[PDB]
Amino acid sequence: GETTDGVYRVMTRRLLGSTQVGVGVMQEGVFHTMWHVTKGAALRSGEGRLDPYWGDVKQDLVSYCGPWKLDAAWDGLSEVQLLAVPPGERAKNIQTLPGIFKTKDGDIGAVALDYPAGTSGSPILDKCGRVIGLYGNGVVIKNGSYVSAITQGKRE
Amino acid sequence: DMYIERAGDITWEKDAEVTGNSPRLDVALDESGDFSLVE
Ligand SMILES: NCCc1ccc(NC(=O)c2cc(Cl)cc(NC(=O)OCc3ccccc3)c2)cc1
Numbered sequence: 001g002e003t004t005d006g007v008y009r010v011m012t013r014r015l016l017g018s019t020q021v022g023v024g025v026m027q028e029g030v031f032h033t034m035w036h037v038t039k040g041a042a043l044r045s046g047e048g049r050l051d052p053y054w055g056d057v058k059q060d061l062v063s064y065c066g067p068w069k070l071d072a073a074w075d076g077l078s079e080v081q082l083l084a085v086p087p088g089e090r091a092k093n094i095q096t097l098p099g100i101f102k103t104k105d106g107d108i109g110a111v112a113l114d115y116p117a118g119t120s121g122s123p124i125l126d127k128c129g130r131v132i133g134l135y136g137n138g139v140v141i142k143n144g145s146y147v148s149a150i151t152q153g154k155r156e
Numbered sequence: 157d158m159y160i161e162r163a164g165d166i167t168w169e170k171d172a173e174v175t176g177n178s179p180r181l182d183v184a185l186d187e188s189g190d191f192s193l194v195e
Contacts, residue, residue, distance in 0.1 A: 045160050057187075058189045094175060099177065101191065
């Protein structure tokens with residue numbers, strides 16, 4: 001199937017019509033998305049099949065066809081872009097200065113942008129176009145709005 | 157049976173729309189991958 005690098009929608013025909021359950025990144029022949037999008041299930045790309053290769057529920061990440069390839073990190077200073085791919089809508093770059101999730105095990109960048117649940121897996125990029133993480137796992141703060149962590153894996 | 161469809165290139169866009177705030181939040185991550193606010 002299509003293995004060209006880029007951002008992709010993850011669709012399902014199980015529910016009403018064709019529903020977008022999330023988004024992912026194809027890089028170096030590997031498809032990267034969030035665990036809650038596919039639950040680790042196999043994916044179709046045209047007539048081809050993408051089989052899971054690595055995944056972890058706690059990190060909320062999964063890779064297909066090969067190991068996790070994305071290893072760029074937010075520098076903790078600069079603005080970033082969420083390349084948002086909302087259901088039924090065109091891919092759109094949104095620039096923002098990340099906030100911080102402070103945890104007992106260290107700090108993580110966070111993006112305060114509100115998108116429908118099916119936008120999960122959209123990549124967050126630095127000024128060089130490198131993927132520094134995926135959008136879609138975070139928290140609901142006082143106002144009812146969404147703040148996502150910048151979730152990044154580890155490149156073995 | 158989930159399937160994928162290309163949505164675009166991964167590139168920085170000059171003069172993209174700039175929005176969103178930068179909150180600093182104390183959070184906890186559980187074994188199920190769920191983040192929660194610590195107050
Ligand atoms: N164990 C992990 C399971 C998991 C499962 C799922 C998720 N992610 C989401 O649910 C998700 C992802 C994105 Cl990109 C945006 C939102 N938005 C959000 O919650 O906004 C508040 C709200 C929403 C709808 C109407 C009114 C208010 C949610 C993470 C993790």
